[PDB]
A paper describes a structure:
Here, we report cryo-EM structures that reveal the molecular architecture of the [name] [name] (TbCBC) complex. TbCBP20 and TbCBP110 form the cap-binding core module, which can bind SL RNA independent of the cap4 modifications that are unique to kinetoplastids. TbCBP30 comprises mostly intrinsically unfolded regions and bridges the TbCBP20-TbCBP110 core to the TbCBP66 subunit, which contains an additional SL RNA interaction site with specificity for double-strand RNA.
To gain insight into the architecture of trypanosomatid [name], we generated a cryo-EM structure of the TbCBC tetramer. Since an affinity assay indicated the ability of the tetramer and dimer to interact with the m7GMP of the RNA 5’-cap, we included the commercially available m7GpppA in our cryo-EM grid preparations. The cryo-EM reconstruction extended to a resolution of 2.4 Å but accounted for only 48% of the residues in the complex. Although most of TbCBP20, TbCBP110, and an N-terminal portion of TbCBP30 could be modeled into the coulomb density, the C-terminal domain of TbCBP20, large parts of TbCBP30, and the entire TbCBP66 were absent. The radius of gyration of 6.15 ± 0.28 nm indicated the presence of the intact tetrameric complex, but the Kratky plot suggested disorder and/or flexible portions of the complex. The reconstructed and modeled portions of the tetrameric complex comprise mainly the large, exclusively α-helical TbCBP110 subunit. The N-terminal domain and the central RNA recognition motif (RNP) of TbCBP20 are well-ordered, but the C-terminal domain of TbCBP20 is not resolved indicating its flexibility. An N-terminal peptide of TbCBP30 (residues R33-I82) is bound in the cleft formed between TbCBP20 and TbCBP110 and the protein continues by forming a large loop across the adjacent surface of TbCBP110.
Residue numbers in the entry:
A (entry chain 2): 1 to 128, 170 to 179
B (entry chain 3): 33 to 82
C (entry chain 1): 31 to 63, 87 to 127, 139 to 167, 177 to 193, 212 to 225, 240 to 350, 362 to 449, 454 to 499, ...
The structure:
């Protein structure tokens, strides 16, 4: 299957101001341009993770889908502590496909998570108690 | 503000607690005597489901 | 449709797009109580097991009036991301052929699928056995259902083939596989048939997961057991939504009873038929195990499957009851590869696997007071410089603290590393200095520098955050590759440090005693043992940076005094550290990307390195801990240990188709589950990286990566034979004799 539910195609519903700031139409520009990026994306937004959930807990859950190339934790800018979400960049899109399918709405740390498809992370996106004092504030 | 105080378990869990209760009720499963003796609020606290 | 921001509904399909729709759906038809009817309409004739909200677009599609599909059947494509069985592919092919000719059905598809395999209900049982084979012996027995129940046996025997085929075909999409399993279960044939269907589905999913993880190589990096656990949880959740319109609680009860039956069979070591002897009324289906559990299946359940399920259910289980009845099963009294483990061991393994997904407070709150001994056993935990590399690694730590992993650079790290080592007295002695070739001296000094670098890395990171560990390994990967360039697959000393009344080589003695150079025991202890056996270069002899660092940090893993029946004989601190090390520093760095944000990997960690690090960690603590002159004391220790082990081996040999529990065991791999997990995951990671590299556009760097990965695979098989896992005793036969793990690797079909 996955040949029958085409929802397997990576689609990201919301729109964001950096995409808004780029002067493109929300049709055939930001939405169409992102599809080529998302159609090759290996990255997922996790969502609803607790503030006290550690990277080991997120790794332990998402590593059963595939190798995690990079795991970026959301961080409140003022305190550099996890702010509720995360970004799990896998090695292959098979892992990201498994994470969105299998791990969406799945209990991670006594919190039901909202694994979705993202285009790719950047230090800017990582922002929005383990004090990540090693990450340069920005 | 303990980490367990901020744990609210999913509404599906009432099915699993009921399933555990039903599994123990038949096949003759009995808790440990000391565990049963935890009638002074010494038994395992259970997280609240919504 | 694909590559689109909006989903388009189904349209008229060409006969190509039909063969595929049929290949991935036609098999499911014979399993329900007419051709030309769409799956939603065919389910209406089965009592509409699934509500309209859960039905999918594909179930809406009706059959076309094409006679081209009739003639193009006279080889079908391959489903993505799964290792399809020869029976499953044959069954789906004959399903399409017999659905076209459709334009007793199940019994003829299974009989006709079997003939295809074995040319050029026992049938519905041999079908499941053929599905789970590279023959599989069924873990859970269907014949134990009651009196006058040939119909119920067939209903479950078909739910097992249906669940197997449904995870083989619908598995990547969990929601769709769960809706197809609910549809099969919730047929309205009879209320007593629902329990049999649920039992068949749960047992089939579990057995398929465990057989897939043993003999199926698909190179996807997705754990079959976690997927099975999430699928069974999704089944329960989806039966909950059907119920809010038999019961979600009942399916959950079979899932638990099937897990508890497996646990009790592991603890009892024999088919005690615990639920059969505890039946409430007899009419109810009670899961029984048809045989004991192989070590691989026990590792699957206690390390992946049950911990994942428990995480899904908030770590809540019938904990006190299970521990009590497992303890009763302990005081009791077969299959060659079957295993018995004590309750303490079983629940210790289960809770250490579970504790990685949570924290100590949650397990403390959940677990009753009867688990206090278990909790204390599963809960100095930090990595500390081993007083070797201490004064050299302090400078590196001061640099790392000052800059941080974000600011750490390879060249500045190299400068600080040389500035710190060269000062140290041992480096001055080695540099200044019966004969030492310049090649040996640069080898011994580069080895010390790399060991200092890795020890400083492990101490600074504490191996607690995978992001920091991965970023630091990525930054320092050129430095590590440059430092291990001279070392490579070569022994640090020119000649073996054991000669001949067997003694150590004079330059080796000089290094250990006068210069205070520390060689990890795996470099010389096996050769010493083999000399001592003779009295009455090896792959592990070749240098491994991670073996040295593991020995320095005291990562000693061993078995239990109770024998094989235990296994978790190791301190909690050392076991937690060896997980955080054999999983972050080795497994997650094997074939890992050169940069953050695939197919471009740095060779800091090799497969042979992981295997030899496990073997070093599994050396006896008597032979691994340094004494308190030192060299001869160590050698005498080795000699007396070898005499004792030879006596034990000869006793076992005269004590003896033959059960593996009755053969000589070193309690190294058959005892520690971290060893087996790491050894399997090495090959799994290599195959996954192979798939990613091949998927990348063809070129030259991809070709180099592919050759590197096949070299890693070949080196992995050779290093395992070096240990004895793939075969008067030999030193490897006395240090790492692991008949259960050896039997698994010799019959897994992956080496
Ligand atoms: C809700 N979000 C938030 N989010 C990302 O999270 C980052 C931080 O969002 P907040 O500032 O709301 O925490 C943003 O840069 C945004 O791209 C998301 N990214 C993806 N792909 N999908 C989603 O549903 C969401």
């Amino acid at each position: 299957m996955a040949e029958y539910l085409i929802d397997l195609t990576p689609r990201m519903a919301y729109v964001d101001r950096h995409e808004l700031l780029r002067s493109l139409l929300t049709e055939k520009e930001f939405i169409e341009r992102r599809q080529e990026q998302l159609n090759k994306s290996t990255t997922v937004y996790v969502g609803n993770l607790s503030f006290y959930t550690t990277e080991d807990q997120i790794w332990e859950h998402f590593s059963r889908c595939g190798h995690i190339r990079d795991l970026v934790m959301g961080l409140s800018e003022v305190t550099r502590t996890p702010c509720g979400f995360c970004f799990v960049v896998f090695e292959s899109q098979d892992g990201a496909m498994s994470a969105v399918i299998d791990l969406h709405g799945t209990l991670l740390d006594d919190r039901v998570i909202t694994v979705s498809w993202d285009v790719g992370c950047d230090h800017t996106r990582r922002w929005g108690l383990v004090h990540y004092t090693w990450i340069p504030p920005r | 503000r303990r980490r367990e105080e901020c744990v609210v378990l999913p509404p599906i869990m009432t099915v699993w607690r009921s399933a555990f209760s039903q599994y123990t009720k038949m096949w003759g499963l009995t808790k440990f005597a000391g565990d049963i003796e935890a009638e002074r609020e010494g038994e395992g606290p259970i997280l609240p489901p919504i | 449709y694909g590559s689109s921001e909006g989903r388009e509904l189904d349209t008229s399909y060409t006969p190509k797009q039909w063969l595929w729709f049929l290949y991935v759906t036609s098999w499911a038809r014979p399993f329900f109580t007419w051709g030309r009817l769409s799956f939603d309409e065919l389910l209406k004739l089965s009592g509409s097991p699934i509500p309209p909200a859960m039905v999918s677009l594909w179930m809406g599609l009706c059959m076309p009036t094409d006679d081209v599909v009739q003639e193009l059947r006279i080889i079908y494509p391959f489903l993505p991301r799964v290792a399809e069985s020869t029976f499953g592919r044959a069954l789906r092919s004959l399903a399409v052929r017999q659905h076209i000719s459709s334009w007793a059905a199940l019994d003829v598809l299974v009989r006709d699928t079997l003939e295809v395999i074995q040319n050029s209900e026992e049938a519905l049982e041999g079908a499941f056995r053929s599905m789970l084979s590279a023959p599989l012996f069924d873990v859970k027995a269907s014949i134990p259902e009651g009196g006058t129940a040939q119909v119920l046996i067939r209903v479950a025997n078909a739910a097992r083939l249906f669940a197997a085929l449904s995870v083989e075909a619908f598995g990547r999409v969990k929601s769709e596989c769960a809706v197809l399993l609910l549809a099969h279960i919730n047929q309205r044939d009879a209320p007593e048939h629902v329990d049999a269907r649920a039992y068949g589905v749960v047992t089939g999913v579990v057995e398929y997961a465990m057989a897939y993880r043993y003999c199926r190589d698909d190179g996807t990096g997705r754990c079959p057991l976690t997927c099975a656990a999430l699928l069974l949880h999704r089944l329960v959740e989806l039966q909950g939504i059907v119920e809010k319109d038999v019961s979600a609680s009942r399916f959950a009860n079979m899932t638990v009873a099937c897990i508890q039956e497996l646990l009790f069979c592991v603890v009892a070591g024999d088919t005690v038929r615990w639920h059969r002897e505890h039946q409430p009324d007899g009419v109810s289906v009670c899961p029984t195990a048809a045989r004991t559990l192989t070590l691989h299946e026990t590792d699957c359940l206690l390390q992946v499957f049950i911990p994942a399920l428990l995480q899904q259910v908030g770590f809540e289980w019938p904990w006190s009851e299970s521990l009590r009845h497992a303890k009763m099963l302990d005081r009791a009294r077969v299959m060659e590869d079957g295993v018995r483990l004590d309750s303490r061991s079983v629940f210790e393994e289960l809770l250490v696997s579970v504790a990685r997904r949570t924290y100590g407070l949650r397990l403390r709150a959940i677990l009753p007071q009867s688990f206090d001994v278990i909790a204390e056993n599963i809960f100095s935990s930090r990595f500390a410089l081993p007083l070797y590399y201490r004064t050299a690694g302090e400078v590196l730590l001061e640099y790392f603290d000052r800059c941080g992993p974000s600011g750490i650079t390879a060249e500045e790290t190299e400068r600080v590393l040389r500035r710190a080592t060269d000062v140290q007295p041992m480096v001055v002695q080695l540099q200044a200095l019966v004969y030492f070739s310049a090649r040996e001296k640069e080898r011994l000094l580069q080895r010390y520098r790399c060991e200092v670098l890795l020890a400083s890395l492990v101490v600074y990171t504490q191996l607690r955050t995978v992001s920091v560990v991965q970023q630091l390994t990525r930054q320092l990967a050129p430095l590590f590759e440059q430092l291990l360039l001279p070392l490579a697959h070569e022994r640090t000393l020119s000649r073996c440090p054991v000669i001949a009344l067997v003694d150590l080589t004079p330059e080796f003695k000089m290094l250990v005693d006068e210069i205070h150079y520390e060689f990890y025991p795996l470099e010389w202890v096996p050769e010493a043992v083999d000399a001592h056996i003779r009295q009455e270069p090896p792959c592990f002899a070749q240098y491994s940076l991670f073996a040295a660092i593991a020995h320095q940090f005291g990562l000693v893993l061993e078995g239990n005094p109770r024998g094989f029946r235990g296994g978790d004989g190791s301190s909690s601190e050392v076991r937690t550290k060896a997980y955080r090390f054999f999983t972050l520093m080795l497994l997650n760095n094997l074939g890992d990307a050169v940069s953050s944000s695939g197919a471009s990997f740095h060779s800091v960690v090799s497969a042979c390195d992981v295997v030899v690090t496990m073997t070093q960690c599994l050396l006896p603590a008597h032979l691994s801990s340094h004494p308190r002159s030192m060299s001869n004391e160590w050698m005498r220790r080795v000699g007396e240990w070898t005499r004792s082990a030879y006596s034990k081996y000869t006793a076992y040999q005269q004590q003896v188709p033959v059960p593996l529990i009755s053969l000589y065991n070193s309690l190294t791999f058959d005892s520690v589950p971290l060893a087996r997990e790491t050894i399997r995951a090495v090959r799994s990671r290599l195959l996954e990286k192979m798939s990613v590299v091949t998927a990348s556009p063809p070129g030259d760097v991809e070709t180099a990566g592919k050759q590197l990965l096949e070299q890693h695979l070949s080196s992995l098989t050779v290093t395992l034979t070096a240990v004895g896992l793939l075969p008067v005793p030999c030193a490897t036969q006395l240090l790492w004799a692991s008949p259960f793990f050896s039997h698994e690797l010799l019959h897994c079909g992956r080496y």
